[PDB]
């Protein structure tokens, strides 16, 4: 079913401390596969997934030089925008650039993205038509005009509808054994009495890929979100993901509460019930 | 693979 590729660029200014820090990270679905750090002795794009390692050194040359090229633009950009915002060169600031594409079960293009942000607030975004730009404030209205005149959108779109999908498809095939495989949630339940009248049930889900999952509670068969709580899905550090849902119930009424787990790699949804 | 670098910056 639907897959993605996304790149995440982060450029921080260090006034006096030297050139801005740049970091680039590439994901297919929820799985990173490449990285770059200006401060790393390496000075090259580096593999972070097994199934990219097999790309010849001409892949790594072009990826290194392109991403270094953007790192230098980001450096000039920081000084331009400090200019636009009339900020002093004492302060440290941040440009983030996200982009990439989605493909459908069919392998075809669905959507593209290119979005930038100054000091962690929307600055400029490419629209869904991949031909127009949304500017967040007056500074980005200048950038927009420039980018409108330069036909920059046509550059993004050519990539997003073009090499972004061409290569998403190679990645998904090359490394199909990890990327198109699912790991189902291995689930258990925990019980902590909070008071002499109230207790907590916690529904766990462990080592699942990909990271999309829906935990839900019922009470005598009926959906319950009152007195329930979800955690941010968190990485395990081994390519899988963990998440839990808690609900607070009256003491001695635990058996009436059931937990519902839905995930890509489950033919039917799973169902749990506290077992002393 | 990554985009080519922005031909014109902000």
């Amino acid at each position, epitope marked *: 079913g639907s897959h993605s590729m996304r790149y995440f660029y982060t450029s921080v200014s260090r006034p006096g401390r030297g050139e801005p820090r740049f970091i680039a990270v590439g994901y297919v679905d929820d799985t990173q596969f490449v990285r770059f750090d200006s401060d790393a002795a390496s000075q090259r794009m580096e593999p972070r997934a097994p199934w990219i390692e097999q790309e010849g050194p001409e892949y790594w040359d072009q990826e290194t*030089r392109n991403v270094k*090229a953007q790192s230098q*633009t980001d450096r000039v950009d920081l000084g331009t925008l400090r200019g636009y915002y009339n900020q002093s060169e004492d302060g440290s600031h941040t440009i983030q650039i996200m982009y990439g594409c989605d493909v459908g079960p069919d392998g075809r293009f669905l959507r593209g993205y290119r979005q930038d942000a100054y000091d962690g607030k929307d600055y400029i975004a490419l629209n869904e038509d991949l031909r127009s730009w949304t500017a967040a404030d007056m500074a980005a209205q200048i950038t927009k005009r420039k980018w409108e005149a330069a036909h920059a959108a046509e550059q993004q779109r*050519a990539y997003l509808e073009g090499r972004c999908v061409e290569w998403l498809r190679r990645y998904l095939e090359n490394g199909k054994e990890t990327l198109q495989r699912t790991d189902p949630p291995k689930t258990h339940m925990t019980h902590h009495p909070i008071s002499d009248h109230e207790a907590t049930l916690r529904c766990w889900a462990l080592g699942f890929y990909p990271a999309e999952i829906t935990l839900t509670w019922q009470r005598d068969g009926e959906d319950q979100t009152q007195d329930t709580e979800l955690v941010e899905t968190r990485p395990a550090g081994d390519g899988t993901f963990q998440k839990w849902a808690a609900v607070v119930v009256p003491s001695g009424e635990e058996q009436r509460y059931t937990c519902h787990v839905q995930h890509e790699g489950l033919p039917k949804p799973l169902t749990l019930r506290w077992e002393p | 693979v990554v985009v080519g670098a*922005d*031909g*014109v910056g902000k």
Partner: T-cell receptor
Amino acid sequence: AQKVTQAQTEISVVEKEDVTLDCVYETRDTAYYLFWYKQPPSGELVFLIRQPWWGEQNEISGRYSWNFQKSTSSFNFTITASQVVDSAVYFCAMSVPSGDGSYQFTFGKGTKLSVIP
Amino acid sequence: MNAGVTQTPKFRVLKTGQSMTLLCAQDMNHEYMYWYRQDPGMGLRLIHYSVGEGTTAKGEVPDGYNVSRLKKQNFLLGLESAAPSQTSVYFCASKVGPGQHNSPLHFGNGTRLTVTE
């Protein structure tokens, strides 16, 4: 492999005529820019146009027209209603990101145009 | 308006083993600067270049030339000992830098140097 090739050294046409100057680039880089420059007998080198890799096939700019064909790795230059003024040397070029991330140029050897009245 | 890429002298003649500095200055606030030479049948061979204040680096034909970039504004081409091989047309050039990768090279007028025995 960084190369630009203008297999035409010398080529002449009569005035009030079309002429096309051929240019063949060769690179494995995918984010490259193509340029043409005019060098009049004066000697100076003048920017005419830039093609981005993502850019469309034909660009127009007055009497000037270019034809970009990735398949043919070609960027051939055409002048309509050629005036003796045109008469010059014409350089094709390509820029690609070098190791430090800076874009850097490969020039063709150039092609000597004589527009004879 | 802007001068662009200004270089002197326009003309120079040296005895073998004399020295000179070709001076180049650009009022456009460009980060990259270049020194080329242009010889019949060889088009534009780059000698040295510079991507910013304080950062010379070799091109495809450095030997017998050296350069300085004390300031962003200027790029000096030194011939410490002049050889008949160095009789050529020398062309300074600049480029805005990473703010605009698609930027072309801006050339100068060019020096015409003749080294003789």
